[PDB]
Amino acid sequence: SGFRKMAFPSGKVEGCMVQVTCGTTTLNGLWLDDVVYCPRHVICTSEDMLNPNYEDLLIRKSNHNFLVQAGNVQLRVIGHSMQNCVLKLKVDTANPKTPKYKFVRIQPGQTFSVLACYNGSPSGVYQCAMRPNFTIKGSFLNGSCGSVGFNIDYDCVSFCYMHHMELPTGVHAGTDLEGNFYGPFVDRQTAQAAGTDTTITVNVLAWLYAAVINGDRWFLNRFTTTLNDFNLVAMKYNYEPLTQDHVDILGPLSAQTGIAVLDMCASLKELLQNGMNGRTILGSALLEDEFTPFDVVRQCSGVTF
Amino acid sequence: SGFRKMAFPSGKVEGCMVQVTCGTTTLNGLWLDDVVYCPRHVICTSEDMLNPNYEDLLIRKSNHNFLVQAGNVQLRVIGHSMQNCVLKLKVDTANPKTPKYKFVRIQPGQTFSVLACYNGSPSGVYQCAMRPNFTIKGSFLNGSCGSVGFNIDYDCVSFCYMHHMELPTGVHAGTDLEGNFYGPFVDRQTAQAAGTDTTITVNVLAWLYAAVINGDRWFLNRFTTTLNDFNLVAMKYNYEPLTQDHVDILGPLSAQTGIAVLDMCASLKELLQNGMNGRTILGSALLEDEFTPFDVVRQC
Numbered sequence A: 001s002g003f004r005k006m007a008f009p010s011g012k013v014e015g016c017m018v019q020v021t022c023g024t025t026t027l028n029g030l031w032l033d034d035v036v037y038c039p040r041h042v043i044c045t046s047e048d049m050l051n052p053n054y055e056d057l058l059i060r061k062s063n064h065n066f067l068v069q070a071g072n073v074q075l076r077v078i079g080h081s082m083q084n085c086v087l088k089l090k091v092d093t094a095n096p097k098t099p100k101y102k103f104v105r106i107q108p109g110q111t112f113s114v115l116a117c118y119n120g121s122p123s124g125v126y127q128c129a130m131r132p133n134f135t136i137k138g139s140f141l142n143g144s145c146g147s148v149g150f151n152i153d154y155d156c157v158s159f160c161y162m163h164h165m166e167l168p169t170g171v172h173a174g175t176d177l178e179g180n181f182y183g184p185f186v187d188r189q190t191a192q193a194a195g196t197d198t199t200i201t202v203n204v205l206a207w208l209y210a211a212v213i214n215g216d217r218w219f220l221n222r223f224t225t226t227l228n229d230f231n232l233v234a235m236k237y238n239y240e241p242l243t244q245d246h247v248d249i250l251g252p253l254s255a256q257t258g259i260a261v262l263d264m265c266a267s268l269k270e271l272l273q274n275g276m277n278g279r280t281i282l283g284s285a286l287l288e289d290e291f292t293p294f295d296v297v298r299q300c301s302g303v304t305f
Numbered sequence B: 001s002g003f004r005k006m007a008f009p010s011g012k013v014e015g016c017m018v019q020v021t022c023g024t025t026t027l028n029g030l031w032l033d034d035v036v037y038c039p040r041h042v043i044c045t046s047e048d049m050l051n052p053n054y055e056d057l058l059i060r061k062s063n064h065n066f067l068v069q070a071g072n073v074q075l076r077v078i079g080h081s082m083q084n085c086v087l088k089l090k091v092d093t094a095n096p097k098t099p100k101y102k103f104v105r106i107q108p109g110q111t112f113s114v115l116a117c118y119n120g121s122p123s124g125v126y127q128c129a130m131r132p133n134f135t136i137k138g139s140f141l142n143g144s145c146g147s148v149g150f151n152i153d154y155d156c157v158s159f160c161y162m163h164h165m166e167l168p169t170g171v172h173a174g175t176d177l178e179g180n181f182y183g184p185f186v187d188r189q190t191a192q193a194a195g196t197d198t199t200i201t202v203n204v205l206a207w208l209y210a211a212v213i214n215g216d217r218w219f220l221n222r223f224t225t226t227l228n229d230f231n232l233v234a235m236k237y238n239y240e241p242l243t244q245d246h247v248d249i250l251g252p253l254s255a256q257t258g259i260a261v262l263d264m265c266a267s268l269k270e271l272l273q274n275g276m277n278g279r280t281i282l283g284s285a286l287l288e289d290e291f292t293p294f295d296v297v298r299q300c
C-alpha cells in the first residue's frame, strides 16, 4: 500500500553528469561514450543572449575554451559541434559508466525523472510531467542548465529532456537530447511566456484508478458516460480531450479494479462539476495529473531496474 | 524557482542493494563493506511470525541457509549475527561500490529518501518523513522489506531507515540500521496499530517560508501570536506542539524573508481557520508537512 510521486533510480544518470565551463559560464553536461552534451547557450555572455548568432559565436571558440570536469578529473575536449540547441563536445575519454541508452522525444502528458545538478554534481531527483503547454513545473536554480530528464525501460535509460531556461511564471523550458525545444520556445533573452495550461485527463483517470487500488472509493458512482459527452465536459474545465487511445491504455487498470474507463469518466465528470466536498483522494485535495497509466501499473506492481 | 518534493540521488544506495533469501522468504539487504544488513524476519515462516523466538530460530541456521545475490553474482555468507531486529550477514566479499556512510537514528518530523527495492533490484525513489506517530507513509508492496531510507548530505550517505512492515492502515514501520524500531512496534504478526497521527508544525511553517521565498504572500497577515496561544490553537487541529527549539531552527528562514517566526505562526493559525478559499500554496491545496527547515534552505 501507499502511493508516492516516485522517480526512477538515478544511479545510471549520475555516472554521466559532468561540469562544463565556457568563459565565465558554468553549467552541466551529459557524458555518454566520448561526447558531452550541454545547452549551446553555455558559449554566450549575458549581452550575447539578447540576440545570439550561435554559429558565429561557436566559430570563435576553440576546444581549449571548453573546460569539462568529470568529478575531480579534467576531460580534454578534442572537437565541438552543434546540433539544434545542444552543443556536442567530443572528449578524449569515453565514459566507462555509460549505461545502455537512447534519446527519445516525449509527448505532453508523459512523465519523467529529473536529476537536478549544479557544477556537474547531482543534488536531487524528482518526478514531473511534460505539461500540455510544453513546459515542466520543475525546481531549478541558476546553474541547473544541462540537468536531464529520463525514464528507464528495463536496463535502457531513455534521455528525454535537457534543461535550458526558466520562464517568468517560474516554469521551465528545455529540449530533447537532439537539441529541439519542447514548445514554442527559443534560447534567447527575449519576451517568452508559457501558454495557458490544461489538465492531463488520462493521467487524472490513471491516478483515480491508483486511489481505487489503494482503498479510496468514495468518488465512485453508479453512472457511465459516452466518450463524446465526457469530452464536452473536459473541454469546459480546461481538461485535455480523452481519445480512444487513452481509453485503450487504461484497459489493464479498468480490468484490475473492475471499473470500466467510461464508468471512471462519470466519477471524474462528477468531481469536476461538484468538487471534493471536503474529502481528499490519496492525500490530495486536487485531482493529480502527473502519473501516467504506466506509472500507476509500475508502482502498483513493483517493476524493478 | 519551483518547489518540488525532491529525493536525494539514489546511485550511492543502488550500488548496495542485494537480494537475501532464507528458505522460501526473499527480501532485500544492504551490502556495506563485508556485511549485509536485512530484517531479521527473513528467517521466519508466516507461522513463526505470531510469536517468533528469533534467537531460537537463528541458532538453527547456518551460513549456507542464507543465499545473498548481488546482481547476477552469488555472495558467500561466512558469518551471521543479530543486532536488535536486524540480521548482519558477514559476507566473503567487500562491496567495491561501498560509499562513505554512517548510520543515523532520526527524530519524528525528519525527512529522508526511500529507495524502494524488490528482489535486490531498485524500482523507485521517493521522499518521506518520519511521522510523529513513528510510522512512514510509504509506497511498499510485499517484497520491499529491507528497502532503506537515507539522506546524502555532503558525499556521505546517512542510512536512517530499513523497511520491515505494513500496518493495517497502509502505513509503514521499520528500524534504524542498528535494528531498533521507530515507534512502539515489534516484528510480530500480533495486533498493532499506528497511533493517531499529527501534522509536523515546524515543517508546515518551513514550507510557508518556501512559498514566501518563491513569491507567494497571499496567506500573510498583520497579526502575530504568543508561542503558547499558537500551541493552544494548533493542538485543536491535530498539529504537533511547536517548541522553542523549532522557533530557533526557523531563524535563518525568518531572517531571509523578513517574517518573524511568530508572525508566520499567525498566518498558519488563520489558514487553519479559513482553509485556502480556492487558492493553492506551491501547487498544493493542503498544507505540506514533509519538508523540514533544512530541506527548504537546501532547495530554495
Ligand SMILES: O=C1[C@H](c2cccc(Cl)c2)CCN1c1cncc2ccccc12
Pocket (backbone or CB within 6 Å): A041, A049, A140, A141, A142, A143, A144, A145, A164, A165, A166, A167, A186, A187, A188, A189, A190, B001
Ligand atoms: O533561464 C535561464 C537563463 C536563460 C536566459 C535566456 C535564455 C535561456 Cl535559454 C536561458 C540561463 C539560466 N536560466 C535559468 C534556468 N533554470 C532556472 C533558473 C532560475 C533562476 C534564474 C535562472 C535560471
Ligand SMILES: O=C1[C@H](c2cccc(Cl)c2)CCN1c1cncc2ccccc12
Pocket (backbone or CB within 6 Å): A001, B041, B049, B140, B141, B142, B143, B144, B145, B164, B165, B166, B167, B172, B186, B187, B188, B189, B190
Ligand atoms: O508487513 C509485512 C509482513 C510482516 C508481518 C508482520 C511483522 C513483520 Cl515485521 C512483517 C512482511 C512483509 N510485509 C510488508 C511490508 N511492507 C509492505 C507490505 C505490503 C503488503 C503486504 C505486506 C507488506
Ligand SMILES: [Cl-]
Pocket (backbone or CB within 6 Å): A052, A053, A054, A055
Ligand atoms: Cl542563431
Ligand SMILES: [Cl-]
Pocket (backbone or CB within 6 Å): B212, B213, B256, B257
Ligand atoms: Cl524573500
